[PDB]
Amino acid sequence: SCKISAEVVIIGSGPVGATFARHLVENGKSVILVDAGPQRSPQPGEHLKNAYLYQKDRTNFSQIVNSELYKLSIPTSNVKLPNLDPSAYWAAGAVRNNMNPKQDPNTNMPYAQAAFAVGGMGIHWTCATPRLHPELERWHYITEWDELYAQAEKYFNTHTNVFERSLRGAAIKRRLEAHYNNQLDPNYPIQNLPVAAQRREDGEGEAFIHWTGPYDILKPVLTTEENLPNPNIRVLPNHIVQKLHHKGGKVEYAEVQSTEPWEKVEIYADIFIVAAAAIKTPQLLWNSQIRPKALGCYLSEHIMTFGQIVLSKEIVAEIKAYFKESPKMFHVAGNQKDPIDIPLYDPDPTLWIPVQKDRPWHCQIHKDNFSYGIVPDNIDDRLVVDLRWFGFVDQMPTNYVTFEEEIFDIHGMPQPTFHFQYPEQDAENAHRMMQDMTEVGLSIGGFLPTPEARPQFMAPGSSLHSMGTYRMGESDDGTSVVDAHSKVWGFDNLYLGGPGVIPKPNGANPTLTAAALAIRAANHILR
Amino acid sequence: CKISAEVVIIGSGPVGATFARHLVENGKSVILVDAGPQRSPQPGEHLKNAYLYQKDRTNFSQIVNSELYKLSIPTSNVKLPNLDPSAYWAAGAVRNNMNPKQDPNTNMPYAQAAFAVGGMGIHWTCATPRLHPELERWHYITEWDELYAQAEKYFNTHTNVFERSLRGAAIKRRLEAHYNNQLDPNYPIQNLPVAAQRREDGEGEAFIHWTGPYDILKPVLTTEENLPNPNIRVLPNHIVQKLHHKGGKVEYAEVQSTEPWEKVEIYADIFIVAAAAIKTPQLLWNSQIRPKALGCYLSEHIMTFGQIVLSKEIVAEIKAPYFKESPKMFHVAGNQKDPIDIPLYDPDPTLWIPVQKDRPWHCQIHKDNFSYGIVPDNIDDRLVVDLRWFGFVDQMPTNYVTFEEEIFDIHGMPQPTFHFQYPEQDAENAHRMMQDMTEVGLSIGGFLPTPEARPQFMAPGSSLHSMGTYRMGESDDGTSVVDAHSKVWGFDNLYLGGPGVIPKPNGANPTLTAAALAIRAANHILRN
Amino acid sequence: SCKISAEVVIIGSGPVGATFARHLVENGKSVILVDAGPQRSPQPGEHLKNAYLYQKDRTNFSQIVNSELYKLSIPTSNVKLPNLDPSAYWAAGAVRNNMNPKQDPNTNMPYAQAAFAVGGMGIHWTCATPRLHPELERWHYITEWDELYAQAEKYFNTHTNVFERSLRGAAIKRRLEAHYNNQLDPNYPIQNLPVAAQRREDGEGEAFIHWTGPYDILKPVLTTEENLPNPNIRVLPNHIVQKLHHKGGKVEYAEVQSTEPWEKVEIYADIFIVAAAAIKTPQLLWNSQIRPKALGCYLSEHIMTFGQIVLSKEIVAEIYFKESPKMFHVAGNQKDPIDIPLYDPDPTLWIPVQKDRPWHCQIHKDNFSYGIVPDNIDDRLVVDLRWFGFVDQMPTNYVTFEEEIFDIHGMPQPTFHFQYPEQDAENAHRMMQDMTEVGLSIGGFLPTPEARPQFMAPGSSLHSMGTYRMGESDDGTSVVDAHSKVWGFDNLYLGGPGVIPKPNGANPTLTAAALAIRAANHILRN
Amino acid sequence: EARPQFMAPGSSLHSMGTYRMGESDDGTSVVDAHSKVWGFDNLYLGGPGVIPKPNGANPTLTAAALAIRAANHILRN
Ligand SMILES: *Cc1cc2c(cc1C)nc1c(=O)[nH]c(=O)nc-1n2C[C@H](O)[C@H](O)[C@H](O)COP(=O)(O)OP(=O)(O)OC[C@H]1O[C@@H](n2cnc3c(N)ncnc32)[C@H](O)[C@@H]1O
Ligand SMILES: *Cc1cc2c(cc1C)nc1c(=O)[nH]c(=O)nc-1n2C[C@H](O)[C@H](O)[C@H](O)COP(=O)(O)OP(=O)(O)OC[C@H]1O[C@@H](n2cnc3c(N)ncnc32)[C@H](O)[C@@H]1O
Ligand SMILES: *Cc1cc2c(cc1C)nc1c(=O)[nH]c(=O)nc-1n2C[C@H](O)[C@H](O)[C@H](O)COP(=O)(O)OP(=O)(O)OC[C@H]1O[C@@H](n2cnc3c(N)ncnc32)[C@H](O)[C@@H]1O
Ligand SMILES: [Cl-]
Ligand SMILES: [Cl-]
């Protein structure tokens, strides 16, 4: 088909896209959810970490991550190999895919990446869903935070009780409480990190976890009270939305490339929503001739420290205590023992220290699966704990993504170009972040002495917590793209979703927050 | 072929030369032997004194790498998973210091030696601290401060070399504030004492004369007539292989001249082995001299190391010297400026925190040249400071070097084999060492984010501060090789020198200490 | 020190410097040999590979090499670390020492290096001393090649018989002869690589070698027939020559920095000679206000392929210290599992440059910055391959010298603009095809990254040439005449590969020493 | 990463012979030429593991052949 329509159209089936669909469909609207990616599960946007094997080997799921993440601007300008056969052909500054010769590496955001899949990053993410600090992180022109957050947490299946029973979790918390010595605000103690996830109930499979994917969010609206699929929602994988066509602040239709069968498609709707995440969202607007002054400016993420540690002998000593009807699930029988003294089904330590007074940064003491700090395959990953601190990045107009007119990316859309540097003001606190992260690590053991696990700042982009590109404000004056209903200045029926909307430097994992503001916009639409 | 002197000293290391200095200066006649070649016009000159090293510190690490030779390289099971099967392979080579009997997991990988007229004393970083009275010294030596004083004179110890460092100040300020008078005021943050001295030669004040064994020998190498002193003779390229002895009197030394390649017998009234931690016991083992304690109580320092880039705050605080009559020494003129805001001739920060109460470890905040943590060639090394903490290693008989009977090293002497592990007791303190080192680093800036400069424990051997192998005691207890006069149990006229003699866990740089005990032994020789 | 003189002054105690001194002193002149470096042996410019340990472990000597070699232009322009604490201070484009913010990396010569030592590179070099191919490599305005070469080989103690008795040398040569199948020119067969070296005669130390250092070259003129040192020669380590002072084409004196004691020194002489090697020589001129148009132009080296191989099982199958068993490192029950006589002389072969083959092959084992064999691997298993290809001398390739930046000696910072000429490209590729086939005929590749077959980055050859090249007339294409004398000057001469004006593949040192002897005769004659 | 080189064992992903076929219950084979396990009525194997013969080619297509064969053997009775 070539022309199709629904009440509402949502570009991007990320967590945020699906949030809109959930709320909108559930309140009687009809929706088309479009994504440029393929569907990587029987059902749309299932979390891929749910598979048995990932339940058994966490470290391995990093390979799925690497497969999901695609760099957005790769500098090609000056690539020269000093040691190539001179008979052989060479040319620098390739432009193919997300190669970009106009990208200065030194103002780049190297690990600015996206995922193109039904589910976006929400089918690989580590599912951490904290709320923003009332005073230090939230902004005031949103009135009903705790209502939205509550509604968001329900949709995401947020939980704190997943790793509650962790023995390592206890052992650490004890040493950290002792380290800090009641210096922390008692409203924000060391505590269990809230996660979009839940322990299973299915017999002995309670040893395993159902992480939340966009699927989980959509599931309730996907079939009627007859198990036949709900007409009010349709999902279109492998549809690159390239252009929004619009006259005088009303959007008429979306120009979309079906990639199989390869055909142009026009999508008409009463309401349009772009949840294509931090960079691809502005890209779509830029390419639709919609360029508010603030677009792709106030580019912001979290400066991060990371490191891994091997547990102290003291801690290991303090623990020696699932799958009682399956001996072979411990990989030994009779005379063979497991030489690792750490219960194999000990729930993973999954702690956080919030952002608080004097601490504009968000600590996670946990173990999850990322592109970096993968534990080697010949080392039992029970030995290790990952640390990830996230610091405030001030939103600045001199930091931005822009879009070339004569270069295009892998979707054949304006090639993104970054100009980004960490603001000098946040520098002192970033360093404090590190001092903090180290002390904490060395209180629960010694560092994993691999290069890969050394304590270190990540290169820009690594947080995957990009924000501010399509930020909100109170008026079309002070430079913002959307209003507090996440609606684009000067347009009747165009809305955005995603961390890009956030106008306020923070340290916490932004996805839950973003879903809140979406619900807000969605209510605005229902009214 | 056959020659003699009153005294013979095996090894022209710092410790060897100390003996020679004291012994010759008090009227004895000496032959100093070394298996190595002489790497300077004069014997055992320090190679860091060359102009270029004064200009580029980082580069001197390449001389170090050229001086250091691994002692036991495990070969036992080496197999390449991706080699053409047509090609020939065999694991467990035995050539040179390759050792198929070496278990890697009990090895001391960076146990190395240098074979040169000067030993390690022509590349070393010249740090000469004294041992903590209570925590590091032992009591059966009565005259510490006298010996130390005499040793420091010979080594040309000085604290005033980096005193005027601007970075040195900026750091000390931040560290004093960090610690908040938690340190014992007897052992504050202070200038690390070094066998070295600022030059006086016109603008060459901007440069340093580090101490080599040469500097130690210089006074006794010529008479009061500038003719060379007959009472001292130096023999490079002579591998001493065997000491020949009866009922505890040593008659002569069996030596291989390597050029011209001929056997040599060396007769003497007194023999001294200062061949350092492993080669000294090796020589004895091969001379059929094996007290129970030989190469046992193997000990070094467990080390943390890391490098940091100075905080912006510190750099801001420094904007103020040397080479005023040579502008081109700053590498810029006219419109070109040096974008690094740190006076190019600012003396290097060279600080230490001693070992003290509650702190059984020795901190150095400095910049010097070692095999590891070399700063990249494309980075101005003014940006960086090196951190090296040295922790207590408890001396235990289940840690040892032994010597194979059917394998030989590069000198054709019994191949050394290590069995070494850091004692569980020192574990807690080692970790405290790290917590300390990091906090200190992060107080003066951020880490240099290269893999090579990350904060980390060194693999065993890295300290180059090996000790205990030929340790001293009060009695022929079976727990010691030498007595408190550094003389071998059951022998009239055989003495040892070097860190190997130290029987007492410590954190500090041991060379100065070793030179003390030598002077002591030397007096025992003079006064007997 | 402050003011002194000799008949002749020679800047640089490299091989070439010493050659001049040898010839000049031996024919009755008095000279001062100056070097910016220190002396790293009892006697000046002894070869450091002669030490016992290097005789036992070859691969270890690479550490001396790394200690001798110093990069000349290190690009600093844009260095930025993506993952450094923002609290921490940083600044790009440092200028300190041989750091150079004006150096484009992509036109750089990264491994353009020098050594600063009494002896130069001649106290670490691998001592390979071939002659240039009559037709393909020599130029003909030099009339007495074979005379000069002969005299040079005597001074260098050249020899072909050092590795003659090699069992691996045989086993390889057999397989290579079979590979090529009489398709080489029979005038330039597979044969023993000539080396400035000689097997020792000292008892069982015949198992070892006396490599040639500049010392060996100087030795005959260093003492009189009275065992007193020769007044006609003086050696000055640690003296940076910064400026030659000159009026109307006659050089009066040399401005020199003693580095200890740190004092200015003026050196007056009847004749001046700069043998400071490819880049530092032009630097000194540039800084002395002597800038012929051709200076540091026609920059040229060898494009190189390199690789290492593990010997075939077939070869191993096919294959001195009797009075010292312990020199084989085994006794009683322990045997050496490597089936290759431990004192089997190292295979040291070459294939010349010839018709259809403008490149110089070496099948050997020696010590360089690159392809050091791992610590834990018996280096008898390995053979190194080094092919050297023609680099065409072109004026758009050059080193220049910044006016506002200085190096570690406080002299104009060198800046490279260099690329391999397109014309030599197809032959370079042929070089590789050749090198591979040859390797795989005598075994498989050592599968480490470091030993893979590969082109070296520019500079790696250490065979830089053309920077102060010679010609027949003050054409503007040359710095020196065929007597190695600088256009427009009475009494200034240069020495070193920099003089060579003609693309070649062979190891140029011997050649350079020839042209020096020639210049030296020219100096003696008048 | 792109240098010429031998791969470490396994890299081919072309493993074979583990459950190889033969003509008789010789002790040298697991399955017969109909890819059926010696001494079993109704158990069959499939995959490169069945191949008893050193080769160089990409084995998947081959394996699919032998399967079709076994499948016919199953249909026929
Ligand atoms: C990769 C990752 C991310 C992550 C994380 C751990 C990993 C390994 N941990 C997190 C954590 O613990 N807590 C948290 O709050 N976030 C965490 N993240 C990041 C998180 O996954 C994302 O912030 C979140 O997924 C954002 O969701 P959003 O709905 O904005 O969308 P998306 O998932 O980023 O993907 C958007 C979709 O848009 C489609 N797209 C893009 N452009 C187009 C066009 N032009 N046409 C059609 N479709 C388009 C993409 O295909 C994608 O599906
Ligand atoms: C390499 C190094 C060492 C070092 C240092 C930094 C580096 C890069 N920094 C130091 C520091 O800051 N403070 C300190 O106190 N020491 C530091 N060092 C180590 C210091 O140089 C050594 O601890 C000291 O040099 C040891 O002195 P000693 O006289 O004990 O001998 P040596 O230098 O280790 O070598 C002795 C000589 O003996 C000869 N030898 C060995 N075996 C034989 C046989 N069989 N026959 C003949 N001669 C033999 C060796 O050739 C060597 O020259
Ligand atoms: C490093 C190396 C080089 C080498 C080789 C292997 C290695 C590891 N193998 C070779 C081979 O097999 N065959 C061959 O022909 N050459 C090989 N080489 C290179 C060879 O060593 C050089 O070709 C040769 O050494 C160059 O001789 P030259 O006399 O031209 O001098 P130099 O040794 O390069 O350095 C001369 C001296 O000049 C002094 N100097 C420099 N600047 C100044 C100033 N301004 N003032 C005073 N003295 C100065 C240097 O200190 C140096 O000593
Ligand atoms: Cl792998
Ligand atoms: Cl005591």
Author numbering:
A (entry chain D): 2 to 322, 327 to 532
B (entry chain B): 3 to 322, 326 to 533
C (entry chain A): 2 to 320, 327 to 533
D (entry chain C): 457 to 533
What do the authors report?
All-in-all, the results show that OPOx is a true pyranose-2-oxidase, resembling the fungal POxs. It was found to be highly thermostable (melting temperature >90 °C) and showed activity on glucose, exhibiting an exceptionally low KM value (48 μM).
In this study, a novel bacterial POx from O. princeps, dubbed OPOx was discovered, biochemically characterized and its structure was elucidated at a resolution of 2.6 Å. It marks the first reported bacterial POx crystal structure. According to the Pisa web server the interface area in the crystal structure between subunits A-B (C-D) is 4000 Å2, and A-D (B-C) is 785 Å2, while between A-C (B-D) it is 685 Å2 with a Complexation Significance Score (CSS) score of 0.63. In total, an area of 28,070 Å2 is buried upon tetramerization. OPOx’s monomeric subunit displays a typical GMC fold with a Rossmann fold flavin-binding domain and a substrate-binding domain. Similar to other POxs, the substantial central void directs to a narrow substrate channel that is regulated by a substrate loop, which is crystallized in the closed conformation and is hypothesized to rearrange to an (semi-)open state upon substrate proximity. For a productive binding mode the sugar must be oriented for oxidation at C2, the substrate-binding loop in the semi-open conformation and the side chain Oγ1 group of Thr127 is pointing away from the flavin N(5)/O(4) locus. However, in the determined OPOx structure the substrate-binding loop is closed and the Oγ1 group of Thr127 is pointing toward O4 and N5 of the FAD. His125-NE2 is indeed covalently bound to the 8α-methyl moiety of FAD as observed in the fungal enzymes. The FAD is further surrounded by hydrophobic residues and the catalytic residues His470 and Asn514 (the His-Asn pair).
